Amino acid sequence: VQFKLVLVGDGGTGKTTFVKRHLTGEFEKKYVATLGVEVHPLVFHTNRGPIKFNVWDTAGQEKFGGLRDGYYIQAQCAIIMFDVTSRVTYKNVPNWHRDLVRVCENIPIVLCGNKVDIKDRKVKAKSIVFHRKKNLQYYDISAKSNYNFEKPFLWLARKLIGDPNLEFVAMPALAPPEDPALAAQYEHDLEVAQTTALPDEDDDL
Amino acid sequence: SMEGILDFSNDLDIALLDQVVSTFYQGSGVQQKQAQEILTKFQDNPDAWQKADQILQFSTNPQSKFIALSILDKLITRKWKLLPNDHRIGIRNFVVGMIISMCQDDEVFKTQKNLINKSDLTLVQILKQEWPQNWPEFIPELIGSSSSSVNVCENNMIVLKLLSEEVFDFSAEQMTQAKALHLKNSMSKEFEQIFKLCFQVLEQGSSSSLIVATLESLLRYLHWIPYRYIYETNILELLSTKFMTSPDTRAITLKCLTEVSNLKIPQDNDLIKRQTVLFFQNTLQQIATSVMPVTADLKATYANANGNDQSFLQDLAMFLTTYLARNRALLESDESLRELLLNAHQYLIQLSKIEERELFKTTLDYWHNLVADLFYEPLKKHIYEEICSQLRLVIIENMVRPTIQLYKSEREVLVYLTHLNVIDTEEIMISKLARQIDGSEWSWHNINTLSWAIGSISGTMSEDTEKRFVVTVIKDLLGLCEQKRGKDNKAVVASDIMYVVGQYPRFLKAHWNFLRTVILKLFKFMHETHEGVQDMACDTFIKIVQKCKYHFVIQQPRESEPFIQTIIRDIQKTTADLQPQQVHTFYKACGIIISEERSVAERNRLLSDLMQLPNMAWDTIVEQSTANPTLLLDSETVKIIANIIKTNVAVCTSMGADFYPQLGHIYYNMLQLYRAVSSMISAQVAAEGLIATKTPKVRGLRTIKKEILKLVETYISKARNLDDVVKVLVEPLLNAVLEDYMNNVPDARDAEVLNCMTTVVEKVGHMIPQGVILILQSVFECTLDMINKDFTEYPEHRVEFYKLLKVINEKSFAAFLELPPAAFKLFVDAICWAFKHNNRDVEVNGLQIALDLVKNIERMGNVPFANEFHKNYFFIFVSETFFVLTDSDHKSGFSKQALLLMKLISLVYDNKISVPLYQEAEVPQGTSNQVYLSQYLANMLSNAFPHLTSEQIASFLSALTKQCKDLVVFKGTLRDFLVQIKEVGGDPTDYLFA
Amino acid sequence: VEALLARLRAL
Amino acid sequence: TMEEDEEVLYKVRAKLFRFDADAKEWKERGTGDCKFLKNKKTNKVRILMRRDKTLKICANHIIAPEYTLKPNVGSDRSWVYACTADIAEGEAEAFTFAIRFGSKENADKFKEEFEKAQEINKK
Numbered sequence A: 001v002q003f004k005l006v007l008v009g010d011g012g013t014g015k016t017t018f019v020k021r022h023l024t025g026e027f028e029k030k031y032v033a034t035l036g037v038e039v040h041p042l043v044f045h046t047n048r049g050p051i052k053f054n055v056w057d058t059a060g061q062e063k064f065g066g067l068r069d070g071y072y073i074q075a076q077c078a079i080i081m082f083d084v085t086s087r088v089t090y091k092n093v094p095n096w097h098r099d100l101v102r103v104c105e106n107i108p109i110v111l112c113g114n115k116v117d118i119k120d121r122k123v124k125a126k127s128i129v130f131h132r133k134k135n136l137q138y139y140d141i142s143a144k145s146n147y148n149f150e151k152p153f154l155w156l157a158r159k160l161i162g163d164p165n166l167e168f169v170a171m172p173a174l175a176p177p178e179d180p181a182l183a184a185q186y187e188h189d190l191e192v193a194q195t196t197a198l199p200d201e202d203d204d205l
Numbered sequence B: 001s002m003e004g005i006l007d008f009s010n011d012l013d014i015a016l017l018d019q020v021v022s023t024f025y026q027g028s029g030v031q032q033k034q035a036q037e038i039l040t041k042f043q044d045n046p047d048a049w050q051k052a053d054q055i056l057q058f059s060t061n062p063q064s065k066f067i068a069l070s071i072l073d074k075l076i077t078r079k080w081k082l083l084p085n086d087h088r089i090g091i092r093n094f095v096v097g098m099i100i101s102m103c104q105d106d107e108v109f110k111t112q113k114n115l116i117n118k119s120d121l122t123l124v125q126i127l128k129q130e131w132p133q134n135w136p137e138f139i140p141e142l143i144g145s146s147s148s149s150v151n152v153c154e155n156n157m158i159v160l161k162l163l164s165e166e167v168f169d170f171s172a173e174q175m176t177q178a179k180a181l182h183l184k185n186s187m188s189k190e191f192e193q194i195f196k197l198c199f200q201v202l203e204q205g206s207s208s209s210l211i212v213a214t215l216e217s218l219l220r221y222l223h224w225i226p227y228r229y230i231y232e233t234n235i236l237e238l239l240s241t242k243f244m245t246s247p248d249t250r251a252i253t254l255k256c257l258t259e260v261s262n263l264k265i266p267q268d269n270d271l272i273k274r275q276t277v278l279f280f281q282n283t284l285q286q287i288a289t290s291v292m293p294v295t296a297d298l299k300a301t302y303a304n305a306n307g308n309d310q311s312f313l314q315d316l317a318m319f320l321t322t323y324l325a326r327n328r329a330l331l332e333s334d335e336s337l338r339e340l341l342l343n344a345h346q347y348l349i350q351l352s353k354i355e356e357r358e359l360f361k362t363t364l365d366y367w368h369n370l371v372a373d374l375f376y377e378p379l380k381k382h383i384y385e386e387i388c389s390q391l392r393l394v395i396i397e398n399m400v401r402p403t404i405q406l407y408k409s410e411r412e413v414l415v416y417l418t419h420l421n422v423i424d425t426e427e428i429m430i431s432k433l434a435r436q437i438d439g440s441e442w443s444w445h446n447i448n449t450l451s452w453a454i455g456s457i458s459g460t461m462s463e464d465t466e467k468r469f470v471v472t473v474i475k476d477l478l479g480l481c482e483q484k485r486g487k488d489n490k491a492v493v494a495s496d497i498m499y500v501v502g503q504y505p506r507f508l509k510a511h512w513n514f515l516r517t518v519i520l521k522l523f524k525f526m527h528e529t530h531e532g533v534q535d536m537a538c539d540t541f542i543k544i545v546q547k548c549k550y551h552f553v554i555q556q557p558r559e560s561e562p563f564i565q566t567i568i569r570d571i572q573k574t575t576a577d578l579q580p581q582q583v584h585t586f587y588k589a590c591g592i593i594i595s596e597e598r599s600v601a602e603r604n605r606l607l608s609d610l611m612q613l614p615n616m617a618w619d620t621i622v623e624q625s626t627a628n629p630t631l632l633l634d635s636e637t638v639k640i641i642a643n644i645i646k647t648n649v650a651v652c653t654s655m656g657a658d659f660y661p662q663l664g665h666i667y668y669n670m671l672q673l674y675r676a677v678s679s680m681i682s683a684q685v686a687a688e689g690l691i692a693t694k695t696p697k698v699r700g701l702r703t704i705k706k707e708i709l710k711l712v713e714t715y716i717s718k719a720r721n722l723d724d725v726v727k728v729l730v731e732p733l734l735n736a737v738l739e740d741y742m743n744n745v746p747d748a749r750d751a752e753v754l755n756c757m758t759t760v761v762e763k764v765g766h767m768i769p770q771g772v773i774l775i776l777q778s779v780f781e782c783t784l785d786m787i788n789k790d791f792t793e794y795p796e797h798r799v800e801f802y803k804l805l806k807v808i809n810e811k812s813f814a815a816f817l818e819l820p821p822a823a824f825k826l827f828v829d830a831i832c833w834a835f836k837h838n839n840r841d842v843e844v845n846g847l848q849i850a851l852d853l854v855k856n857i858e859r860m861g862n863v864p865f866a867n868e869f870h871k872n873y874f875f876i877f878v879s880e881t882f883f884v885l886t887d888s889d890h891k892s893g894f895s896k897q898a899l900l901l902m903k904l905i906s907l908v909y910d911n912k913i914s915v916p917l918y919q920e921a922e923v924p925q926g927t928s929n930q931v932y933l934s935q936y937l938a939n940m941l942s943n944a945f946p947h948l949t950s951e952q953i954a955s956f957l958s959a960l961t962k963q964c965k966d967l968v969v970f971k972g973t974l975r976d977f978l979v980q981i982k983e984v985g986g987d988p989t990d991y992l993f994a
Numbered sequence C: 001v002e003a004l005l006a007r008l009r010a011l
Numbered sequence D: 001t002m003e004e005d006e007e008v009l010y011k012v013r014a015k016l017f018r019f020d021a022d023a024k025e026w027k028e029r030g031t032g033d034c035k036f037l038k039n040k041k042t043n044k045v046r047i048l049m050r051r052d053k054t055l056k057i058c059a060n061h062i063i064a065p066e067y068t069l070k071p072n073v074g075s076d077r078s079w080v081y082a083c084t085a086d087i088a089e090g091e092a093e094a095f096t097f098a099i100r101f102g103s104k105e106n107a108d109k110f111k112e113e114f115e116k117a118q119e120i121n122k123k
């Protein structure tokens, strides 16, 4: 039971960072532009069983667009992403939506305004109304602070499964298991790690 | 093996193409990733379009045919006009022919909707190039073939839908103004025949798939077609009755009727008024009889999420709110229309109970529109009394924590509803309060929601009624707290009690003994260990103080001293259990009160008493830490010092100009402390390396420096005596921070220094020209070298740098005149460097500095520095501005780029540049800069965009310079240029549009 | 009004 | 969830990092509650940590007595220690872990409980 999810939006809006956070828990601070598309399987554990998303993380920059709307064929759900600190990324949301629903005429779509962690927000909440007539679900999100970072997949899971009461549940925790020829090896890696400062030491956690 | 199709010298192996395509779509892992890079490279082949006719006819994979049409699409939209003519007619009949063949095979027409729609969009791209000047019979032949087959007729509706979108909905960004208008007029000139086909299909039935596709196209027509097509036919009757009954057409029909409610209609014809009432009455009738009655529980329906119920209820809310916001007056006077009006609003009431944030905001905007109207419009509110009564309950029960934007919208409507009937509002709130007491609705969330609602309507009731209401609410809330047992319950009720009282300052101001009891209870709460209680007591304390500060500074009747003195006397006992940041809020609150005292000697005395504890800890540490500076190694001392400074920041934040006496008490020793801390940071980086800047020890030390800079910034930004700032503060400050910044390694420089200097230049820059020069010398070159190697490193230094240059360019431009010519050249390089940033903060300032710099140079008149500036940097600024305008990577700054470019071109066509922009030999003598500007621009654009014709470049520049006194038209011409550079063969006459 | 104070303090 | 047969000895909020030695870079693995779970029918104590919202496991390993908690250069509220068998993402892998807390107090309390659990696990 796996579903194809296309992720579209202007370059730099955080699509790749948002997926990475869900894949590994990491926050990628660097902007390495996606070239064409990257496919990533993403599994969530629900009270209705596991649900698998084949996330097609497409490229936002035009010079790296690749197959463009070719990536959308047979998509079963989608996330349109923009940057609340960049008005132009919201101005382009109708363009991405147009290209998307011309190929996928009847799929659940989430509209995401990313980077709400930044104080100087440029796209005010009362200005975000495009989702209304297009029946898209909207969420303020931040891949940096994890604000609502689970909501887009929770909503899509409920739509794709047909159960408004579907919930994320805890994966079962197996008991964990219990060499001198690798002592000097682990001591080398550990000494480099102690002298590499942990990132974001000013955060609350 | 997979990379064979990239070889075009051979024949294309179609079967090998589908293998790469299938491995991409249905594959996974490394093989899918490899096929992906192959397909991208195949599609990006500039000769891939040649092999599109083979793929499209002999391939059996629809994804491959789809990819082929994408290759065609890129060819049609970018290089169509470069092709030999026979290729263009050869692409056209190929696409027209395939679409006909796909429509005739019912199996393909049923199974390959994606490929057919992709073919239709590709056809529309051809129409945008060829129609109607090279295809005047398209619309007639389309109407002809429609009656032949239902399948091709349905597909014709898809083609017309896409055509209407490309011409009217998405043309603004994608084609020139002339090209857009040409197509709009062409569609407008032949719509009569198009609407005739559309109306016939709608009225004759009977294929759902054909009817829906026709309604889908009608939705697009309503964006632009004249209203006569809607009101002078029978189409409103069909939409509001026939097509609302069947669920297949109901969704699209409801969207059409929403758009009909936005048609530009005449407001004085009574027949159009009746037609507007009539389709609303039919639509509401069909919903009541075919979907659900007005009493239905829409909240439960939406939560069940069956089929398309959520989309329908969303669309119904949009239809109702849209129509009623424009036309509800048509229903308010006729007695026969009263039930229709109230049933419409009763549906909206039911929609407003749905648990869906974004839907609630949509209905809340309409309620705001309504109750605002009932508040001002005569004789209106009595109509909606039962609607408004239910609304009060809906809003009270969905009150959110004060998105704060949603709370402010809820508060605004509830305030209106309280004005419209004060008595009903109080009754609902007390009733809900009783349901909290009897336990039937008791909940942590429910008691907070009610308190927020009760708090939101403050200032709308009369003071007498508010007095009795507040007392009643506090009474019930008090009894609710005593009834509960356990900490957690008693903590939640106690906070809500404190929230409500903080929301009613008018009540507090008139009942001192009550106000004092509240404050003393808050003080008592500052010793409670329970989580959140202390934050609640501090937040409420300063909130009450902001609104009631005058009652803390006067000597109240029955009292021997102003209550401010009583707070100060016991401040150590009160805050002894508080976290440092909670202590700073407390001190800031006291600073608010003290500033109300306008007797200078009394204010300074209160300020001295308030700062007694931090001043004594300060005097001690300055004594001990100076003999000898080893105590600053202790992280405990570093933390204590930061807290003392932060306390000064908190008090200075609320007292501003009044803080000056306290600043003078610590100023010299603080700057001395700044130097001592700076030495240890430097010593630490020398002894341990750059990694030392990440250590807690050094981060603690830099915290002291940053808080000192923030304190000085905070005062200077609010100071009223600038003479004291210039002659007492500025000189020791610069000596403390400038050299230390310049001579530290980059990783140890505090960006806060740049920020602090920005404030200094902003307030008193005009009074310290030698100081501004000193700031530039110490921070300009060394900070520029930190930020001119990439757009990534040192982000804060980057933003503050350009904020600092901007204010220097505004307030002390003389400082740049003194720069050595090599340094002024770096200044120009830095400005253009800011152009190329995608970072909005840097980009906006870079363009603003450029604009302000040009103005500064212009004000100098005909003077050797002004002329040398134009000789050296005019064409640098013109060409660098053109680069970011045209590179598709700085679209966020288009408006500022255009303004700067327009100013640059206007200087030449106003003859404001006295010197020659050219060399004496490069161009004949007596040539105007205007003639030379056109040459330089023509040659620049010819080399930057070699695919343009010389005629295009000449027409664009002729229009651009001609329009340099009209920003809106100037920008339109730039947008037309940005479209034409994306293709070959742009019409040069397009630039005559204005 | 004055009857609230005792209960307010006793929270 | 396969946690009912265990007992909660210690529970603290924390952020967990894995060290990418090939990139000279720390990378977050998850933020949420870190728990010390004492199995009732083996008396062994393990680290079990789940991410908030998604509840996905980002740390699952026994508090081995071999492991040693060491400070990080840029933090007074974190510990770095090598792990040789963590099964959070499947097959037992080895990591150099870093875990950060809200305060120096919770970091010192963690190290206390971490060592008490080390003593329980060598009996």
Ligand SMILES: Nc1nc2c(ncn2[C@@H]2O[C@H](COP(=O)(O)OP(=O)(O)NP(=O)(O)O)[C@@H](O)[C@H]2O)c(=O)[nH]1
Binding pocket: A009, A010, A011, A012, A013, A014, A015, A016, A017, A018, A028, A029, A030, A031, A032, A033, A034, A035, A058, A059, A060, A061, A114, A115, A116, A117, A118, A141, A142, A143, A144, A145
């Ligand atoms: N502050 C903040 N920055 C974020 C957030 N999400 C992403 N970013 C930053 O935004 C930048 C762009 O990241 P990326 O995910 O590559 O964007 P993208 O949309 O995938 N780019 P492209 O479309 O070109 O592939 C990165 O530097 C990343 O750190 C967020 O929630 N907050």
Ligand SMILES: [Mg+2]
Binding pocket: A015, A016, A017, A032, A033, A034, A059
């Ligand atoms: Mg990316």
